[PDB]
Design a protein around this ligand. Sequence first.
Ligand SMILES: *CC(=O)N(c1ccc(-c2ccns2)cc1)[C@@H](C(=O)NC1CCC(F)(F)CC1)c1cnccn1
Ligand SMILES: *CC(=O)N(c1ccc(-c2ccns2)cc1)[C@@H](C(=O)NC1CCC(F)(F)CC1)c1cnccn1
Lengths: 305, 305
Amino acid sequence: SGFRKMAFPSGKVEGCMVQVTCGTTTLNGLWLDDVVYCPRHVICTSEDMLNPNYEDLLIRKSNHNFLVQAGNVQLRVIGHSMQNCVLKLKVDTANPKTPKYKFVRIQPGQTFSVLACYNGSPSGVYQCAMRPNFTIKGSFLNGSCGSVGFNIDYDCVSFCYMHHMELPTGVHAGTDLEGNFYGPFVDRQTAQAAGTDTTITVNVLAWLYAAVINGDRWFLNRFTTTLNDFNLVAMKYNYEPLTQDHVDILGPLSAQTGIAVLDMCASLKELLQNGMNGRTILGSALLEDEFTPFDVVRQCSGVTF
Amino acid sequence: SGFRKMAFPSGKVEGCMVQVTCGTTTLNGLWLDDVVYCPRHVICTSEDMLNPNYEDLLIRKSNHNFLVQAGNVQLRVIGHSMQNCVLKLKVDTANPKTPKYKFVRIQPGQTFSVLACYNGSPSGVYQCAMRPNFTIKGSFLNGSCGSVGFNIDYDCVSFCYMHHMELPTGVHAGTDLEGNFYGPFVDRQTAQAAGTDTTITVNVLAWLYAAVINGDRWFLNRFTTTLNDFNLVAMKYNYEPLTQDHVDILGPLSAQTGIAVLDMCASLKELLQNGMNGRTILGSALLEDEFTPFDVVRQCSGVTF
Ligand SMILES: *CC(=O)N(c1ccc(-c2ccns2)cc1)[C@@H](C(=O)NC1CCC(F)(F)CC1)c1cnccn1
Ligand SMILES: *CC(=O)N(c1ccc(-c2ccns2)cc1)[C@@H](C(=O)NC1CCC(F)(F)CC1)c1cnccn1
């Protein structure tokens, strides 16, 4: 029993974290085989940030200008290139702790674990959702850039995020491991605000299913609804449209609890219209939307890696 | 910026997790040097549970009856003994991934990371507080027993908890790594309910300081209070007494924000008496008490390991 915001075991990612320094600036790198991936703004100074010419700046850097450290051991850089907003530093030593891995670009609404690092040393692990507005609500201080987000399926680590910058609203923007930003954000000190966010409706439904499984059932009403009628209410409360794909992905939770998805939609509709009246669901006083249907399944079936 | 419920990197603990099987029952073991620590109820069957005679049951077990697996590799047991509610299985191979470690008994109100495991394989990491009633609100399914709780200071892993059982209220009970239970709980299927819990006042104050640091300042009132007057209000709302020790441990957060501890107490007093009026603090609609003053400091200073 019990439901908790749960991260993946970070051990396989800990073994890939290195420190990258180019002159003044130091941040985190991801070491897989004989390549170190890091944000390209490592080559920017405190005076380049408004609109840095990354091509020009990189040209003036040698392999020897890049100080890469795996603990107290320096890795010799023998090649460097830029792919979008990330640098790829070729080193003469392959990471002996290189796990089975993939580079994926996740969808908005999907969740991943972040290993927060400073100077190539991991500080903590936490679970994030890619927001519909293509930001993440993380915990990142100065020198956190190059920290990665990931999912694990048995033995394979799927890297989906590398941290680049914070927006003035204190939310976070980054790239896939091909260095393409999530959302319209750019790696420079410019005027860029996140679009208005929305609640991940399918995730709220998943979390309500988690509540029932854990015996927190107070909110279940005697009603049903059409998908169309639910989505008209959802729209009013800034919830994203629930699609048949969403209904289908909720099937295992519906099968386990015996509650039809449109019946759970009816209970959610009432919670949105009437509020929670000072009550809690799984120890929360508001509706939680950063648990995917698979997150709920994993935590309620005990899938290991 | 940002504040998140953050676990320690689990890598050092992942390398210590093994599977222990004695006949019918399989659970998790902690492998340090040439000793495997696990709950003693591994030697109980489904018919022994009401009041198992652990001494009698253990006597009838051989070294060879204990099947210990580190992945797919069997560890040969060459000795076994019982210390309180844990077994110590001596194996012929020392764990090559044995980190620098200690066994501590934590105080109520203190926090630690849990590495949830099944069949010696880690599923997830999450942050817990030892409740004043000596339970933890974790996420544990069948076969989770032997999963450990820990803190990390630079290189040293301090093991403070091993999971044993769930209470009918869905809260969790376990032991230190000397096998002494936290609280009055026993490893058998008996009538044992957790005493009434209380809110960890010093932790709520720490979390309010975290909010101010992150720029969530709406709740700060223009008032102060005596420690004595605060504790009379706190008592009414089932908050534990705030001691001078608690005030002293909050000093760094008071120094950083410029808010005197008794001034923060005045703002907390108003929140308790008037509620939050539908508003949130660090994205929560109720007052959070599972962040220690040091947890807030670590996450707001970026301490690595
Ligand atoms: C890398 C890092 O941790 N941070 C950072 C992001 C972006 C840049 C850029 C340089 C060129 N284009 S954008 C540099 C550094 C920090 C961060 O924003 N730190 C600032 C501190 C003040 C300053 F020095 F003036 C400018 C950098 C970061 C990232 N994520 C969260 C919080 N801080
Ligand atoms: C080890 C484990 O995961 N669990 C467990 C706890 C305690 C015992 C005891 C045996 C003798 N004294 S107490 C055995 C197993 C489970 C758990 O309680 N599983 C039960 C399932 C039904 C049953 F088989 F009839 C009896 C065991 C556990 C632990 N923590 C959370 C959830 N489940």
